[PDB]
Structures are given as structure tokens and as C-alpha cells.
Amino acid sequence: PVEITVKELLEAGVHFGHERKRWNPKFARYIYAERNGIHIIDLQKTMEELERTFRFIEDLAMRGGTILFVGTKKQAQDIVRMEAERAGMPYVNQRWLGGMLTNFKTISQRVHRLEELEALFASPEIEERPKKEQVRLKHELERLQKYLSGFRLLKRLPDAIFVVDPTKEAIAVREARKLFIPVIALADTDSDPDLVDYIIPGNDDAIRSIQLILSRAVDLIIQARGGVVEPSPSYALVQEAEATETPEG
Amino acid sequence: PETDFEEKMILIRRTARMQAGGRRFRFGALVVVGDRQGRVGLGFGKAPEVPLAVQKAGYYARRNMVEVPLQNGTIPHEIEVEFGASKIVLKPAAPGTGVIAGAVPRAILELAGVTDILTKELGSRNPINIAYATMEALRQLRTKADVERLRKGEAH
Amino acid sequence: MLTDPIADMLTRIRNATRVYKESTEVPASRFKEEILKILAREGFIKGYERVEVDGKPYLRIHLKYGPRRQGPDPRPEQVIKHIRRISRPGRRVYVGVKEIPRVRRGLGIAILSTPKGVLTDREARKLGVGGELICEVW
RNA sequence: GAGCAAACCGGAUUAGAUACCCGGGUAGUCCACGCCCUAAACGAUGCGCGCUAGGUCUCUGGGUCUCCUGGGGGCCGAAGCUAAC
Ligand SMILES: [Mg+2]
Ligand SMILES: [Mg+2]
Ligand SMILES: [Mg+2]
Ligand SMILES: [Mg+2]
Ligand SMILES: [Mg+2]
Ligand SMILES: [Mg+2]
Ligand SMILES: [Mg+2]
Ligand SMILES: [Mg+2]
């Protein structure tokens, strides 16, 4: 049953039958206290820390600060970009690079090739040598973009970090704290609530939680201070958040 | 503000590695940079040429400094610190005592801007870990123990 | 069966703090209880309070630390960075008054056990007496 | 005293083989009582006791029993330790 949330998209489900001899284990469902992914233990402990954290995201915001989020799991990545562009800041989906922060003065160079290439495919210099290098410059521009598509907003090392799972993207969190950078992350029982600077004890995994915690973390920024504007947002045309703007091919 | 101190090279070495054909030296410099006002920092970078080796260590130096709590001209109090096998130990001394210590600990203490100490040594008199040796010492000197024992503790 | 009742406590506090526990329990007894009275008046530990566990008396020592730190390894500095036993059993170390220790150049105490209650380098000297040198804390 | 096997008897390989290989063979290995007491008799890590994250596999008793509590064996690992391993 899809409570107006599922939407009938002619989803067959012919190959989706439970004929997968799934009728094999009785204890198949070892079930615990994790049936939908919404845990809040001790409350007087977590809610205390939340206010804490979210009070800073607000501060770093107003102080003009910057917050690059760090995403690495498939269980996020894209969920990192939406909350990325919606909130004008740098993000890292694909993969971290040793030094992303403890080497700026060098990884930032890559960012430069990137921009450099991005210039050339805009001037008449297009096509002046063998297709080979033409592609030699396309591979790069392409790759570079794959791994640097979000680091282009880091003219200088950031005031904070928002890594999802400070245990899977630990290098990130190492590099960070080695440079006195408050590290903000999700974290759970299977994490280092000692390393995480400003914790938000959500579910490390679980798409939903992510989008839930990461969004307000994005909205809180945006709503930093305020203003009038009371005609509210429109529904169906929420494309500026990114969605799937203009395709190529 | 200003980020310039006085540099002192502690001890340099050629290191030699080996390959088909022959050997290949890598140089090691051990430098200490200081203010003589409370800040000092060790550093040892390697290189195929001593200078860079020094310069590098000159950069590693300035990056690892430690504001030393000097009272008058000495260390506020006593400390002995274990390292590899080295056991530097410094003892605060009256004025007019002099530095009084090894090539290494002296190179370090004398930049932290000390003037009167008495040093305890007892193992691996190795220019390197005695170097480091003298520093965690300087990192463990106390500022505000007076505060930590009596102050509240909110948000830890 | 413990061999040195005190030393046990001291240590139980020592490791306890190295892992940053909030408080540790230790077998009760006047002495230990009087020995912790000092660590408490002196700030090394928020405090102790007689407690029961399984039916046997124990003492809950609420350890005290410092603030979290910046950079790698953010664990809080220690309040009791060092706490050794001096006068062990089969090693009784009694010192005169002029033999009382100075300890961590006044940054630390040294609990004595003079025929006049359990005092610290300070007091004991102030009162003018010496006795078994139970420990040295800093 | 079946098999095996120092010494030893022959066979072969070798530049030479009192050796590796091959065919026999004694003490011995076996049991009884007595003697010897050594060992890489090694976890190369004395005994006892208290304290300090976990996870994983496994033997054995209790258990409101595929979870927790006791004893023993392995693995990986917190802090810590170590010259390093
Ligand atoms: Mg040692
Ligand atoms: Mg000395
Ligand atoms: Mg025969
Ligand atoms: Mg040996
Ligand atoms: Mg039972
Ligand atoms: Mg066991
Ligand atoms: Mg291990
Ligand atoms: Mg470790």
C-alpha cells in the first residue's frame, strides 16, 4: 500500500514476485527495534545535543561561514547534491582524495585544470590538434568534473564538515580535526561519537533519515536571519533545487 | 601579526638506502625554531640535499610549536618524559643557574627562552627522541591546573 | 583477596580516568573514605558517596576531567594526571616532618597519615607532624 | 621381541663416500621392579589477586535458553604497552 506516496507508475512487478523461494526461513525476520529506521534514544541526551549542533549550523551560517558536506555512500551521494545546490555550498559525492583538506594548496590545482579546460571548450580553440588530445582534454574535463564537481566552491578550506557516517568517511573526519575544523556528522552506535565534533545521532544509513536530517540542516542555513516573502513555494515546478535540469543527448 | 623566529640545526645525517647498482643517500636535518618568549618547535624533514632538508624541517618546525609557560626564566615546575628509550627530565632552577643540559635539550630549551634549568637524562641518548623528548616535556608543563581542579564542567 | 587495599583504590581511579569513565566504585572502608576526602576537597574528583551494590559497601568516586580539546585526539585533559602509591605494604615509607615531600612543586599533594588524621603535605607541615606517606597525587 | 632401527653387513650414486638412496641387522623401541632427570622440559612469557572497550568463532554448566550470566580454548581489536615484531 502506497499512501499517496508510491504513485502508480505502471510498475509491473512481474519479475518482482516472491517466488524467490523466500518461503524458506521462518526466522527470516530476526526483527529487533529497527523496523522503519527512526531511533531516538535517551532523548534528554540526544535532543540536548541536537539543539547544540543545529545552534551552530545557524551560527556558522550567519557568520558567513561555509559548510561542505561529505557524502560517499550510495545511500546518500545524490541526496547530498540536492541539499547542496539548494544551499549554495560545496559537496563531495564520488570519492574523497587523500588531502582534500590537508593539501588544499595542491588538490585545488586540479580544480584549476578543471576550470582551465572548462574555458577552452568555450573559445574557438576547439579542434586544433588530433582528436586524440581533443579527447585527452575531454576525459580530464570529464573526470575532473566527476570528482571535483562541488569542490569548485572552496576558494579556501571550510569552517565545518557534515560527513554522513563519520566511520565510513573517517579519513574525511581525520583530515578535518587535524586542521581544527569542527566536524559535523550523523553517527550511530557503530561510530565514534568522540570524533564527531557536532553530532546529530540520526541513522548513518537509511536514505530517509539522511534527507530528513540533512535538509533542515540545509533549510536552517538558508533561513539564516530571514525576511518577509509570504507567497509560499509552488508545487510541481520545484526545479531550481536541481531535479533533472536540461539533458545532453 | 608576525611569524618569524630564530632557527637552530640540531643534527644532520646522510641515510643511504640500497638498490641494484649502488646506494642512495637521503638527508636528514633536525631543526628547532624559537621566540625565546615561550614558543618553540622541533622539525625533521628529509631530502636529497641538506638545504632543502633544512628548509623543509624549517617549515615542519614552525608548524609544531608549543607556547612554553616560563616563570621568570625557568619552567614553572618539574617533569620527566619517557620517549623511545630516552627519559629527559627538567627541574626548575633559581636564577643565575645557567641552562645546563645536553646539546639537544639545550638547543630546544634555549629557544623556548629559558635561562635556568637542570636536566635529567637516562636512556637512548638519541639526538632524535631526546629532541622530541624535551618537547612533550614542554607540552606537559602546567597552565591552569589551578583552574581545572576547581572550575565547573559544562559541555564536555 | 586484595593485598594492598588502598593501592587498589588509587589504581581503580587511575585506569578509570584513562578511559574517561564517569565514576568508579571501590570497596568501602574508613581509611579509603578518608583518603578520598582529600582528593575531593582538593579537586581531583567531583566526589564520592557511600553506595551499595549486590549488598556489599562500595564507594562511588565521581571522577573529574577537563574540557574536550581541539585537533586530533579530542579527549579531555586529566585532573589526576598521575596518582602513585609511595608507602606500599612490606615497604612502609614513613617520613619525618622535615622529610615531608614537596610534590609536583606544589601542583600536587601527597597524602600523609599522621597520628593526627589524614592530611596533605600542606596541612601536615602546617600542623607540624609526619607519618606514613600514603601517596602522591597530581 | 611382530614391525621398526644406532652400531654393523652388503648393494648403488660420487672425483672420494666410513652419507643422503637401497637390502639385511644388533642394542634399542615392549613389559616388571630399580636407576638416570636431561630437554627448542617453549606460551622461549613464575604464582595469586584487584582494575581497564568491544566484536567474532568455539568447548563446557546455569539460565525467564539461537539472548543474558560462570568456567576453559582461539581469532580480531579500545585505551595502554613495546626497540620493533
Ligand atoms: Mg622504557
Ligand atoms: Mg638529565
Ligand atoms: Mg630377526
Ligand atoms: Mg633469551
Ligand atoms: Mg537461572
Ligand atoms: Mg574466556
Ligand atoms: Mg591483537
Ligand atoms: Mg592503539
XYZ file of C-alpha atoms (C1' of nucleotides) and ligand atoms in Angstrom:
636
model
C 0.000 0.000 0.000
C 1.429 3.352 -1.112
C -0.300 6.118 0.891
C -0.371 8.667 -1.938
C 3.400 8.386 -1.692
C 4.070 5.426 -4.001
C 2.273 6.614 -7.204
C 1.139 4.152 -9.893
C 3.903 4.416 -12.493
C 2.798 1.272 -14.391
C 5.256 -0.648 -12.189
C 4.779 -4.207 -13.402
C 6.407 -6.280 -10.700
C 6.293 -9.433 -12.859
C 9.921 -10.241 -12.082
C 9.263 -8.859 -8.572
C 7.271 -11.888 -7.405
C 8.148 -13.525 -4.073
C 8.677 -16.817 -5.912
C 12.343 -16.311 -4.946
C 11.804 -19.269 -2.613
C 11.685 -16.545 0.057
C 9.344 -19.003 1.790
C 12.461 -20.721 3.178
C 13.381 -19.151 6.545
C 10.779 -18.798 9.329
C 13.224 -16.794 11.452
C 13.830 -14.856 8.229
C 12.799 -11.826 10.267
C 15.166 -11.827 13.256
C 13.405 -8.500 13.965
C 14.697 -6.091 16.585
C 13.850 -2.434 17.361
C 14.838 -1.176 13.858
C 11.699 -1.746 11.708
C 11.462 1.645 9.889
C 14.651 3.493 10.812
C 13.632 6.119 13.407
C 15.648 5.832 16.634
C 15.915 8.485 19.331
C 17.444 7.076 22.484
C 17.756 8.772 25.859
C 16.072 11.899 24.389
C 17.208 14.147 27.287
C 20.561 13.223 25.794
C 20.032 13.393 22.044
C 17.592 16.303 21.868
C 20.044 18.139 24.116
C 22.860 17.575 21.616
C 20.669 18.356 18.621
C 19.785 21.841 19.798
C 23.523 22.061 20.386
C 24.559 21.154 16.842
C 21.776 22.952 14.975
C 22.576 26.038 17.023
C 25.974 26.119 15.326
C 24.866 25.413 11.763
C 22.901 28.586 12.396
C 25.964 30.383 13.744
C 28.373 29.249 11.067
C 25.682 30.363 8.667
C 25.182 33.939 9.897
C 28.915 34.440 10.498
C 29.029 33.929 6.764
C 30.826 30.646 7.288
C 30.960 27.745 4.842
C 29.942 24.098 5.282
C 30.975 21.455 2.777
C 29.016 18.262 3.193
C 30.740 14.980 2.634
C 28.904 12.099 1.043
C 30.318 8.749 -0.004
C 27.668 6.048 0.310
C 25.209 5.258 -2.478
C 22.721 5.517 0.359
C 23.226 9.298 0.022
C 25.509 10.828 -2.620
C 22.771 12.327 -4.768
C 20.887 13.083 -1.567
C 23.907 15.242 -0.914
C 23.665 17.352 -4.048
C 20.030 18.410 -3.696
C 20.720 19.635 -0.169
C 23.838 21.013 -1.817
C 22.755 23.375 -4.552
C 19.575 24.191 -2.651
C 22.074 25.511 -0.093
C 24.841 27.269 -2.026
C 27.824 25.272 -0.715
C 30.479 22.673 -1.732
C 29.831 18.949 -1.531
C 31.693 15.700 -2.181
C 29.797 12.680 -3.538
C 32.056 10.451 -5.584
C 35.187 9.844 -3.572
C 37.442 11.656 -1.196
C 41.020 12.299 -2.157
C 43.758 11.991 0.403
C 44.336 15.560 1.426
C 41.092 17.095 0.149
C 41.724 19.381 3.123
C 45.313 18.676 4.308
C 46.642 19.541 0.886
C 44.290 22.183 -0.499
C 47.297 24.044 -1.803
C 47.515 21.201 -4.285
C 44.213 19.466 -4.804
C 42.890 22.920 -5.598
C 45.257 22.778 -8.575
C 43.135 20.020 -10.067
C 40.212 22.356 -9.598
C 42.248 24.751 -11.722
C 42.760 22.365 -14.633
C 39.043 21.789 -14.408
C 38.263 25.471 -14.752
C 41.008 25.805 -17.379
C 39.521 23.048 -19.532
C 36.051 24.465 -18.945
C 37.367 27.614 -20.591
C 38.802 26.087 -23.755
C 35.593 24.321 -24.820
C 34.025 27.786 -24.960
C 36.519 29.613 -27.179
C 37.383 28.941 -30.846
C 40.348 26.800 -29.746
C 38.043 23.814 -30.150
C 39.770 21.469 -32.606
C 43.393 22.426 -33.356
C 45.180 19.077 -32.967
C 44.417 15.344 -33.366
C 41.077 14.137 -31.958
C 43.304 12.227 -29.564
C 44.229 15.199 -27.381
C 40.808 16.708 -28.041
C 39.570 13.711 -26.093
C 42.663 13.820 -23.842
C 41.147 17.095 -22.716
C 37.618 15.739 -22.668
C 38.497 12.735 -20.476
C 40.035 15.128 -17.988
C 37.387 17.873 -18.071
C 35.036 14.945 -17.623
C 36.879 13.071 -14.879
C 37.907 16.250 -13.114
C 34.241 17.202 -13.137
C 33.272 13.793 -11.738
C 35.456 14.162 -8.655
C 35.682 17.969 -8.391
C 32.057 18.831 -9.120
C 31.459 20.617 -5.844
C 34.926 21.472 -4.663
C 34.748 24.449 -7.030
C 33.138 26.478 -4.252
C 36.096 26.050 -1.922
C 38.351 29.012 -2.551
C 39.626 28.244 0.953
C 39.375 25.439 3.496
C 35.828 25.441 5.039
C 34.654 26.322 8.564
C 32.908 22.999 9.098
C 32.115 19.485 7.817
C 28.848 17.485 7.538
C 30.013 13.936 6.693
C 27.293 11.274 6.645
C 28.686 8.354 8.697
C 31.835 9.534 10.479
C 33.031 5.955 10.313
C 32.782 5.237 6.561
C 34.252 8.610 5.616
C 36.664 8.692 8.537
C 39.647 9.934 6.561
C 37.498 12.969 5.954
C 36.954 13.348 9.663
C 40.622 12.746 10.381
C 41.931 15.329 7.963
C 39.306 17.690 9.290
C 40.132 17.630 13.004
C 43.849 17.638 12.235
C 43.161 21.149 10.895
C 40.949 22.412 13.725
C 37.771 22.211 11.732
C 34.607 21.464 13.659
C 33.364 18.200 12.229
C 29.609 17.644 11.998
C 28.267 14.157 11.248
C 25.386 11.686 11.641
C 26.839 8.779 13.627
C 25.085 5.953 15.464
C 26.099 3.085 17.760
C 28.540 1.869 15.131
C 30.525 5.131 15.092
C 32.911 7.349 17.074
C 30.732 9.883 18.944
C 34.087 11.128 20.231
C 35.439 12.090 16.852
C 32.248 13.725 15.620
C 32.500 17.332 16.730
C 28.833 18.326 16.478
C 26.794 15.137 16.337
C 23.256 14.521 15.082
C 22.567 10.890 16.213
C 20.461 10.018 13.191
C 20.708 6.768 11.209
C 24.060 6.558 9.434
C 22.357 4.618 6.645
C 18.625 4.961 5.770
C 18.025 7.369 2.860
C 15.014 8.909 4.559
C 16.745 9.905 7.812
C 19.501 11.398 5.689
C 17.196 13.560 3.611
C 15.404 14.423 6.844
C 18.398 15.465 8.869
C 20.389 16.908 6.001
C 17.519 19.030 4.673
C 16.698 21.015 7.816
C 20.461 21.363 8.089
C 20.150 22.997 4.702
C 16.965 24.908 5.498
C 18.310 26.180 8.811
C 21.184 27.729 6.898
C 19.014 29.225 4.182
C 16.536 30.590 6.743
C 19.527 32.177 8.490
C 18.096 35.519 9.730
C 15.022 35.809 7.493
C 12.725 38.165 5.617
C 9.107 38.684 4.512
C 8.106 36.831 1.318
C 4.833 35.089 2.199
C 3.528 33.736 -1.154
C 4.998 30.318 -0.250
C 6.721 27.895 -2.709
C 4.951 26.305 -5.695
C 4.439 22.549 -6.153
C 5.421 20.594 -9.294
C 7.827 23.256 -10.594
C 10.389 22.873 -7.781
C 13.086 22.514 -10.459
C 15.574 25.152 -9.271
C 16.520 22.755 -6.442
C 18.058 20.927 -9.409
C 15.749 17.982 -10.191
C 16.909 16.942 -13.690
C 17.586 20.240 -15.463
C 18.363 20.112 -19.201
C 19.727 16.789 -20.649
C 22.550 16.312 -23.209
C 21.863 13.619 -25.786
C 50.925 39.999 13.220
C 54.391 38.298 12.932
C 55.501 34.635 12.285
C 59.341 34.763 12.384
C 61.697 33.227 14.920
C 65.338 32.087 15.234
C 66.315 28.711 13.755
C 68.977 26.231 15.008
C 70.030 22.967 13.261
C 70.316 20.185 15.828
C 71.829 17.264 13.920
C 72.152 16.240 10.270
C 72.652 12.801 8.746
C 73.018 11.069 5.373
C 70.917 7.940 5.323
C 71.731 5.721 2.400
C 69.263 3.194 1.029
C 70.198 0.466 -1.410
C 69.357 -0.598 -4.914
C 70.725 -2.631 -7.806
C 73.704 -0.599 -8.858
C 74.663 1.021 -5.603
C 73.410 3.164 -2.750
C 71.260 6.300 -2.476
C 71.562 8.796 0.365
C 68.637 10.747 1.777
C 69.476 13.592 4.062
C 68.104 14.369 7.452
C 68.195 17.671 9.290
C 66.830 18.186 12.808
C 65.825 21.796 13.434
C 64.423 23.829 16.306
C 62.784 27.251 15.829
C 62.004 29.624 18.704
C 60.942 33.021 20.077
C 62.788 32.990 23.396
C 59.478 34.166 24.687
C 57.626 30.904 25.024
C 57.314 29.369 21.612
C 59.475 26.623 20.125
C 59.101 23.723 17.763
C 61.138 20.742 16.505
C 61.109 19.504 12.979
C 62.845 16.944 10.831
C 62.218 16.718 7.128
C 64.284 14.682 4.712
C 65.695 15.455 1.250
C 68.260 14.632 -1.469
C 70.046 17.808 -0.498
C 70.782 19.034 3.029
C 69.496 22.632 2.420
C 66.069 21.652 1.319
C 66.365 19.227 4.195
C 66.966 22.169 6.495
C 64.401 24.443 4.870
C 61.789 21.699 4.934
C 62.443 20.996 8.588
C 62.290 24.790 8.901
C 58.715 24.519 7.709
C 57.884 21.449 9.717
C 59.439 23.252 12.604
C 57.291 26.387 12.694
C 54.193 24.230 12.273
C 54.790 22.265 15.528
C 55.317 24.851 18.158
C 54.491 24.952 21.826
C 53.901 28.038 23.954
C 56.037 27.243 26.977
C 54.910 28.514 30.390
C 58.013 30.302 31.590
C 58.022 31.740 35.103
C 60.704 34.448 35.246
C 63.251 32.496 33.264
C 62.549 28.898 34.157
C 59.984 26.194 33.722
C 57.271 26.549 36.295
C 57.810 23.098 37.665
C 59.351 19.602 37.312
C 58.724 16.971 34.602
C 60.359 13.808 33.284
C 59.191 12.413 29.990
C 59.569 8.993 28.505
C 60.040 8.564 24.803
C 61.590 5.810 22.865
C 64.126 4.892 25.499
C 65.110 8.424 26.376
C 63.857 9.947 29.673
C 64.519 13.705 29.663
C 63.679 15.377 32.899
C 63.855 19.015 33.611
C 63.988 20.658 37.010
C 63.172 24.343 37.609
C 66.199 26.254 38.901
C 66.928 29.529 40.696
C 68.167 32.452 38.593
C 71.853 32.535 37.693
C 71.915 28.769 37.447
C 72.517 28.652 33.718
C 70.901 26.293 31.226
C 72.758 23.128 31.976
C 71.836 20.266 29.681
C 72.634 18.266 26.558
C 73.271 19.513 23.049
C 69.725 18.626 22.161
C 67.576 19.619 25.131
C 69.688 22.778 25.285
C 69.109 23.618 21.625
C 65.399 23.366 22.454
C 65.165 24.889 25.894
C 67.373 27.800 24.832
C 64.924 28.802 22.178
C 61.892 28.419 24.349
C 63.634 31.279 26.042
C 64.687 29.568 29.230
C 67.703 30.587 31.282
C 67.809 28.349 34.287
C 67.201 24.605 34.324
C 68.739 21.366 35.433
C 68.099 18.396 33.171
C 67.561 14.619 33.885
C 68.629 12.098 31.126
C 68.675 8.346 31.298
C 68.499 6.395 28.071
C 68.809 6.233 24.316
C 70.765 9.471 24.274
C 69.493 9.671 20.696
C 69.541 13.135 19.228
C 66.074 12.444 17.884
C 63.836 11.196 20.659
C 65.674 13.266 23.206
C 64.712 16.081 20.858
C 61.079 15.063 20.929
C 61.871 14.151 24.486
C 62.414 17.669 25.564
C 59.262 18.790 23.851
C 56.400 16.831 25.247
C 58.114 17.866 28.451
C 57.489 21.413 27.366
C 53.998 20.361 26.281
C 53.163 18.949 29.682
C 54.151 21.923 31.832
C 51.036 23.241 33.609
C 48.930 26.331 32.913
C 45.743 26.488 34.997
C 45.893 23.145 36.808
C 44.833 25.713 39.370
C 41.694 26.120 37.261
C 40.924 22.599 36.263
C 40.671 21.296 39.752
C 38.182 23.937 40.864
C 36.230 25.033 37.770
C 32.813 23.652 36.743
C 32.454 21.456 33.679
C 29.753 22.372 31.148
C 29.743 20.778 27.754
C 32.437 18.118 27.630
C 41.812 -11.309 48.108
C 43.328 -7.852 47.806
C 46.866 -7.412 49.125
C 47.057 -3.621 49.368
C 43.537 -2.186 49.972
C 44.474 1.401 49.094
C 46.672 0.863 46.067
C 43.666 -0.937 44.717
C 41.554 2.196 45.040
C 44.168 4.535 43.657
C 44.504 2.346 40.557
C 40.797 1.774 40.208
C 40.692 5.560 39.885
C 43.707 5.658 37.603
C 42.531 3.355 34.859
C 39.011 4.584 35.392
C 40.122 8.036 34.340
C 42.267 6.882 31.423
C 39.132 5.648 29.698
C 37.197 8.619 30.915
C 34.521 6.758 32.916
C 32.065 8.985 34.798
C 32.628 7.394 38.176
C 34.035 4.196 39.608
C 33.132 2.077 42.596
C 35.640 0.832 45.131
C 35.402 -1.258 48.355
C 34.482 0.977 51.288
C 36.459 1.487 54.459
C 37.123 4.395 56.824
C 40.607 4.875 55.546
C 39.921 4.824 51.825
C 36.953 7.012 52.686
C 39.231 9.412 54.478
C 41.777 9.228 51.691
C 39.159 10.204 49.139
C 38.103 13.075 51.372
C 41.263 14.760 50.247
C 41.107 14.063 46.541
C 37.680 15.631 46.909
C 38.468 18.759 48.900
C 41.376 19.200 46.563
C 39.520 18.955 43.284
C 40.866 15.764 41.678
C 37.350 14.267 41.831
C 33.854 15.750 41.998
C 33.263 13.359 44.853
C 32.332 10.073 46.433
C 29.183 8.878 48.190
C 28.610 5.647 50.134
C 26.724 3.258 47.841
C 25.638 -0.375 47.845
C 25.996 -2.977 45.100
C 24.884 -6.606 45.456
C 24.834 -5.989 49.190
C 28.423 -5.038 49.851
C 29.530 -1.463 50.601
C 31.447 0.292 47.858
C 32.397 3.853 47.178
C 31.350 5.669 44.016
C 34.079 8.005 43.030
C 32.788 10.548 40.566
C 35.841 11.387 38.510
C 36.584 14.862 37.275
C 38.218 15.704 33.967
C 38.534 18.815 31.865
C 37.047 20.139 28.573
C 37.141 18.411 25.177
C 40.048 19.564 23.049
C 40.702 20.823 19.553
C 42.657 18.979 16.866
C 43.129 15.157 16.687
C 42.586 13.112 19.839
C 39.928 15.360 21.406
C 39.820 13.638 24.793
C 39.783 15.938 27.868
C 42.958 16.707 29.806
C 43.253 14.862 33.107
C 42.696 16.207 36.565
C 44.517 13.293 38.114
C 47.297 13.014 35.528
C 49.276 10.909 37.961
C 48.441 9.112 41.191
C 51.063 6.776 42.624
C 51.410 4.801 45.839
C 54.504 5.516 47.848
C 54.280 3.650 51.111
C 53.482 0.146 49.951
C 52.977 -2.852 52.314
C 56.225 -4.596 53.032
C 57.866 -1.236 52.223
C 56.400 1.097 54.790
C 57.594 4.617 53.979
C 57.226 6.934 56.966
C 58.780 10.396 56.718
C 59.598 12.917 59.414
C 58.180 16.455 59.268
C 61.346 17.823 57.684
C 61.138 14.807 55.367
C 57.631 15.519 54.066
C 57.634 15.711 50.251
C 57.220 18.833 48.159
C 55.355 17.062 45.331
C 54.964 18.381 41.762
C 56.296 21.652 43.061
C 53.054 22.372 44.875
C 50.950 21.378 41.842
C 50.186 18.164 43.657
C 49.567 16.906 47.133
C 50.945 13.968 48.993
C 48.500 12.424 51.408
C 50.139 11.631 54.688
C 48.808 9.646 57.543
C 49.928 11.300 60.708
C 48.727 10.324 64.146
C 46.566 13.430 63.640
C 44.106 12.353 60.944
C 44.868 12.074 57.222
C 46.455 15.299 55.940
C 48.299 16.622 52.943
C 51.888 17.844 52.564
C 50.457 21.277 53.293
C 48.386 20.674 56.418
C 50.727 18.057 57.846
C 53.564 20.508 57.560
C 51.348 23.300 58.840
C 50.381 21.222 61.898
C 53.967 20.107 62.351
C 53.924 16.308 62.095
C 54.998 13.445 59.888
C 53.941 9.871 59.276
C 53.312 7.127 56.754
C 53.411 8.679 53.304
C 50.343 7.074 51.759
C 50.510 8.610 48.292
C 51.372 11.359 45.879
C 48.718 12.836 43.547
C 48.918 15.334 40.659
C 60.625 -59.363 20.756
C 55.636 -58.577 15.109
C 57.309 -54.058 12.777
C 60.918 -50.724 13.009
C 66.068 -49.496 13.698
C 72.024 -46.623 16.348
C 76.311 -49.645 15.692
C 77.496 -53.034 11.979
C 76.924 -56.191 6.752
C 76.376 -55.591 1.662
C 74.199 -53.011 -2.607
C 74.376 -48.139 -5.639
C 75.385 -42.981 -6.518
C 80.456 -39.892 -6.072
C 86.386 -37.001 -8.103
C 86.297 -39.827 -2.983
C 81.720 -41.577 0.447
C 83.240 -44.890 6.805
C 76.457 -40.168 3.940
C 71.858 -38.670 1.552
C 69.241 -43.773 -1.794
C 68.703 -49.422 -1.466
C 68.592 -54.733 1.025
C 69.582 -57.058 5.654
C 70.690 -56.229 11.204
C 72.281 -55.876 16.849
C 71.381 -52.729 21.123
C 67.017 -50.420 21.323
C 61.876 -49.351 20.830
C 57.988 -53.536 24.842
C 56.517 -55.072 29.961
C 58.173 -55.643 35.517
C 60.824 -53.587 39.522
C 65.101 -50.451 40.491
C 68.380 -46.158 38.331
C 69.048 -41.831 35.469
C 66.426 -36.091 35.400
C 68.052 -34.010 30.999
C 65.240 -31.123 27.018
C 63.743 -25.672 21.470
C 61.042 -29.795 29.650
C 58.666 -23.108 24.740
C 53.230 -19.962 25.539
C 61.275 -19.403 24.753
C 56.280 -15.134 28.717
C 56.527 -17.725 37.885
C 52.150 -17.806 41.177
C 47.853 -15.178 43.228
C 44.734 -11.124 43.369
C 42.033 -6.404 42.041
C 41.187 -2.860 37.753
C 40.730 -1.319 32.111
C 36.137 -1.081 25.010
C 34.376 -4.208 22.048
C 33.480 -7.751 18.370
C 33.938 -12.979 16.297
C 34.340 -18.364 16.396
C 34.424 -22.482 19.681
C 34.247 -26.336 24.170
C 31.608 -26.992 28.920
C 27.303 -25.778 33.445
C 23.162 -22.282 34.747
C 19.683 -19.605 32.604
C 12.928 -16.118 32.037
C 17.618 -20.724 26.541
C 19.941 -19.130 18.908
C 19.785 -13.503 24.288
C 21.935 -12.841 29.046
C 25.303 -14.746 33.473
C 30.061 -18.552 35.034
C 34.488 -21.599 33.733
C 38.254 -23.051 29.524
C 40.226 -22.627 24.272
C 41.332 -19.481 19.534
C 40.725 -15.361 16.438
C 40.489 -9.789 15.540
C 40.858 -5.289 18.268
C 39.695 0.138 22.724
C 42.937 2.545 25.910
C 47.629 1.398 27.236
C 52.189 -1.009 26.333
C 56.702 -2.237 23.242
C 63.153 -1.035 20.330
C 60.073 -3.178 16.749
C 57.613 -7.552 15.842
Mg 61.434 2.225 28.810
Mg 69.306 14.949 32.585
Mg 65.353 -61.095 13.106
Mg 66.916 -15.309 25.614
Mg 18.928 -19.325 36.345
Mg 37.039 -16.588 28.124
Mg 45.619 -8.043 18.708
Mg 46.342 1.944 19.747
